[PDB]
Amino acid sequence: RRLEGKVAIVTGGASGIGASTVRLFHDHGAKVVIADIQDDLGQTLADRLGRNISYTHCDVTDEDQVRALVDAAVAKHGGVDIMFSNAGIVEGPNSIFDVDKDELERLMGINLVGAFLAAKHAARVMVPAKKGCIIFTASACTEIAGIAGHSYTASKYGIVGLMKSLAVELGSHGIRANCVSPFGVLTGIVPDDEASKLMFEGIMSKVGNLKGKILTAEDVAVTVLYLASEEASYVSGVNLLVDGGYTVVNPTFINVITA
Template sequence: MATPPISSLVSQRLLGKVAFVTGGASGIGEGIVRLFHRHGAKVCFVDVQDELGYRLLESLGGDKDPNIFYSHCDVTVEDDLRRAVDLTVTRFGTLDIMVNNAGISGTPSSDIRNVDISEFEKVFDINVKAVFMGMKYAASVMIPRKQGSIISLGSVGSVIGGIGPHHYVGSKHAVVGLTRSVAAELGQHGIRVNCVSPYAVPTNLAVAHLPEDERTEDVFTGFREFAKKNANLQGVELTVEDVANAVLFLASEDARYISGDNLLVDGGFTRVNHSLRVFR
C-alpha cells in the first residue's frame, strides 16, 4: 500500500472538537480561528470588533456552516464572557479547547514616571484578568468531563524585560504565572493548560500605538525589517500562521501530555545573546 501524503496524515486534527477563541476577529486570533475551522473544529470566536468578526464569519461560510459562529464579547466584562461560553456550550454541547488570545500592547512609554495608571490597569484587565476569567469558565465546563485544553497567548515579553512597556511585559509574565498555577490545579482533572509566546509578528497589535490611518504598508515593511534585523533565526519571517500552528499543536492530541508549558515561538530570540558578537 502506498504511503499517504503527509498533508492527509495531519488533516482534521481537531475533528469534532469544540473551541472558543477570544480576540478572534483579526491578527493572530483570526489565524487561529481559520486554522481550527480547517482542522474540523466547531469554533465560537468573540471580539469587540464586530465588523471584522462578521466579515471573518462570512468568509468561513456564515449561516451556511453550522460549525462556526461569532459573538460580540468584551472579555473584561465577566458576564459577557460567561454568557459567550454558555452560548458555545448550548450551541455545540460542550467545550474542549479555550484559547485566551485577546490582548493589547498598551501605549509605549520609556519613562516610568510618565505611565498613566489607568493605562496600566486597562492592559492588565485585558491581558491578565480576562485570561483568568477565560480559564475559570473553561474549567467549569471541562472539570466534569475530566478533559480539555486551555491555551493562552503570551509573548517573548513573558520571559524577558526591555522589549515593551512595563504594563505589557508585566502582564505577559503574569499570563505565564497563571498558566503554571492553573495547570497545577487542573492536572488532577485531566485538563492541560499551556501558553504560546511568539516573537514579533506583523499585525495591527504590533503598531496599535499608531492611529489607524498611519498603519501603512511602509510602516509594516519597516516593522518587518526591524524584526528581521534583531531576530536570532535568519531567513525565516515569523507569521500569524506559525503562531496558529503552535496553538493547534497544543490543542491537539499530539500534545496530550504537555501541560504547564510556555511554548516560545521565537527562533531562539529569548535564549541567546549576541551582544558579545561571538557568532555575528
C-alpha cells in the first residue's frame, strides 16, 4: 500500500511498539530489518514474516554496531527510507533520591545516545538519497510531568530537542524528522493471561482523559505509519502525541470542587 518498495529500520523492533510497527510496515509492502538485542524474539519474528524482513543485532550504545546495521541494510535492499529509533528502557514516576548515577548514565546511553547515533548514521545514508524519513520514540512525559521517571523524562526531552534540530538541518536535503510521544501501552510490563490485561485495561479507562478506547501498540503503529507515509510529505519537527488529551489537562481543580 503506502510503503510499497520502501525500506525501514526499526530499532527495538522485536518487542512492544517496535514489533507492531514492524508488523505494520511489513503489511504495507516495506522491506524491513528488525533491529534489537532480544535475538530470539527478533530473529524468529523476521523469519516468521519472511522474505522482505531481515534481523540484525545492534546495541545502540556501540557506534560500530550501529554503522554496521545501516550499511548492512543499505547493501541488502538498496537504501534506507524510514528510521524508527524506538529502542529504549523505561522508568516509572519516582524520586530524584532514587536516581543512581550509574543507572542514570546507562539509561541516557540507551535512550538518548542511542537516538543520536541511530540518527547520525540514518542521516549519513539519507543525505545522498535526498529522500527519507526519521521517527523517534519519545513519550507523553515530554508535554506533561508525572507519568515517568526523572531520568526517563530528561532522556525523552533530549530526544525531542534532537528531533527538532534534525528537522532544521536535515530539511535542507528533503528528509523529515518527527517524534511520537505515546502513553503507557500494555506491552512493557509482564503479561499473564487475561487477568492482567483486563485489570490494566480498566485502569487505563480510569486515568485516561479520552475514555472509551484503549491504547494498544497497533494504535501507536498506525500513527507511525502515517508519520512515515508520504501522506505526511510536509510534516517535520512534529512531536505527535498519542495520549488522548492526557497531557493537556490537570483535573485537580474540577475534582476538588466536586466534593
